[PDB]
Amino acid sequence: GDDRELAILATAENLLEDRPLADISVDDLAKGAGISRPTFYFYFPSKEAVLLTLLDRVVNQADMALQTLAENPADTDRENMWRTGINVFFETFGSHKAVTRAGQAARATSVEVAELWSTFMQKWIAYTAAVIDAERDRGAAPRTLPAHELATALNLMNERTLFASFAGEQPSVPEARVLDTLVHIWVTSIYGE
Amino acid sequence: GDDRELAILATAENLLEDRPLADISVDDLAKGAGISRPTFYFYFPSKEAVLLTLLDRVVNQADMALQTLAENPADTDRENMWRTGINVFFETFGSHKAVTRAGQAARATSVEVAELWSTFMQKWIAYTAAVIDAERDRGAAPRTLPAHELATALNLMNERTLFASFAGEQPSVPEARVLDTLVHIWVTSIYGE
Numbered sequence: 001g002d003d004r005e006l007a008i009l010a011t012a013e014n015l016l017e018d019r020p021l022a023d024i025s026v027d028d029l030a031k032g033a034g035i036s037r038p039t040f041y042f043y044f045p046s047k048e049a050v051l052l053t054l055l056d057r058v059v060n061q062a063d064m065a066l067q068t069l070a071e072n073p074a075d076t077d078r079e080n081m082w083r084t085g086i087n088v089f090f091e092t093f094g095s096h097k098a099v100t101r102a103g104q105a106a107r108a109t110s111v112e113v114a115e116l117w118s119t120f121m122q123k124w125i126a127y128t129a130a131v132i133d134a135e136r137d138r139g140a141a142p143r144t145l146p147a148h149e150l151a152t153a154l155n156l157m158n159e160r161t162l163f164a165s166f167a168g169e170q171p172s173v174p175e176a177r178v179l180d181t182l183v184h185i186w187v188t189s190i191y192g193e
Numbered sequence: 194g195d196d197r198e199l200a201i202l203a204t205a206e207n208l209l210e211d212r213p214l215a216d217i218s219v220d221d222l223a224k225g226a227g228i229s230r231p232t233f234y235f236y237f238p239s240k241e242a243v244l245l246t247l248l249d250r251v252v253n254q255a256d257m258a259l260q261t262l263a264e265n266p267a268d269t270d271r272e273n274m275w276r277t278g279i280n281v282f283f284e285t286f287g288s289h290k291a292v293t294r295a296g297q298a299a300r301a302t303s304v305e306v307a308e309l310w311s312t313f314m315q316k317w318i319a320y321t322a323a324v325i326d327a328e329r330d331r332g333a334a335p336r337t338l339p340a341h342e343l344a345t346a347l348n349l350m351n352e353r354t355l356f357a358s359f360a361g362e363q364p365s366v367p368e369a370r371v372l373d374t375l376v377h378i379w380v381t382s383i384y385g386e
């Protein structure tokens with residue numbers, strides 16, 4: 001009953017490691033979760049909607065993980081704070097590469113995939129600006145760029161660059177170097193200047 | 194003869210201001226340039242190949258423009274040097290928004306659009322790292338991150354963020370704020386930490 005949903009979801013995740021959404025049919029999703037095509041249609045309107053449910057769970061996992069960090073401050077320097085935060089995304093999306101890759105491709109195609117991405121980006125940017133602002137108020141960060149514009153550009157960098165790394169794109173920062181790379185750019189631009 | 198090619202190219206550019214490639218047919222390209230469908234096929238294999246020729250000319254215009262700057266150093270501070278360079282891309286792509294937007298969408302679909310992008314990105318990154326390195330050698334920039342990894346991340350930021358701005362995406366930096374925003378992040382991260 002609820003198993004079947006999870007099974008359809010685990011099946012699409014597995015099949016996306018090997019091939020793109022366009023190359024996975026409803027039939028393959030049904031088969032893999034051990035159910036018929038019309039039983040599939042009872043849980044999902046389309047394969048597309050399977051991607052979106054997967055993407056939704058990744059995005060919320062990153063989100064919840066970032067909330068957790070916010071409710072319990074790590075006893076540490078300013079560099080490590082930023083690093084820990086950026087690491088929520090590196091680990092969460094980086095443990096879900098096929099879904100990341102496919103969810104990103106679907107922004108071109110699906111207005112809901114586009115709007116789910118857009119909603120959380122705005123949320124993660126507003127939080128980065130709140131923290132930059134907090135940092136400015138206590139006198140640790142200088143008042144340079146508008147905090148919101150700086151956070152916008154830093155979030156957008158992290159999106160393209162984390163995602164280029166996970167996909168092994170040319171060019172990209174090697175995955176084992178990407179965290180350090182982002183964290184130097186966040187910390188120099190936030191504290192410098 | 195050669196007019197016809199330019200006319201087909203100017204027509205696709207115009208039609209892309211209003212609608213996506215998928216919504217422009219070969220027929221519309223033919224009509225707009227004042228020729229038949231089969232006369233179209235004599236200049237181009239597909240609409241797709243029309244996009245790619247347009248994208249090729251934009252990319253080379255940015256490229257040539259960046260070469261020019263390199264052959265005649267502006268008599269100026271380090272911030273303005275970077276600003277002038279980033280401005281080549283802001284102006285070039287930003288004067289060609291529909292082609293930018295469509296060329297970017299086509300990376301998902303066209304291996305040649307993907308490979309043309311990938312080739313110039315590698316070139317623009319190698320040049321940014323050469324200049325960062327040069328800057329380190331003269332003692333103006335500190336040896337922090339590997340120059341090539343830093344340039345990778347800065348180029349990728351500029352791509353997503355310039356392109357998000359030109360498309361009016363949510364979120365995005367306002368277009369009238371994006372240059373200043375990028376330039377503070379390049380200069381703090383290159384000279385800081």
Ligand SMILES: Cc1nc(-c2ccc(S(=O)(=O)NCCC(C)C)cc2)cs1
Pocket residue numbers: 081082084085086087089121124125127128131154155156158159162
């Ligand atoms: C200590 C703190 N870190 C953050 C924070 C850290 C990283 C990011 S992020 O890496 O820029 N995430 C948004 C884009 C993802 C799709 C890759 C966003 C916010 C906010 S407060």
Ligand SMILES: Cc1nc(-c2ccc(S(=O)(=O)NCCC(C)C)cc2)cs1
Pocket residue numbers: 274275277278279280282314317318320321324347348349351352355
């Ligand atoms: C003074 C100099 N500036 C550069 C330089 C400046 C900007 C950029 S760039 O803005 O990062 N361009 C590559 C991506 C485009 C599609 C947006 C790349 C290199 C190299 S040397």
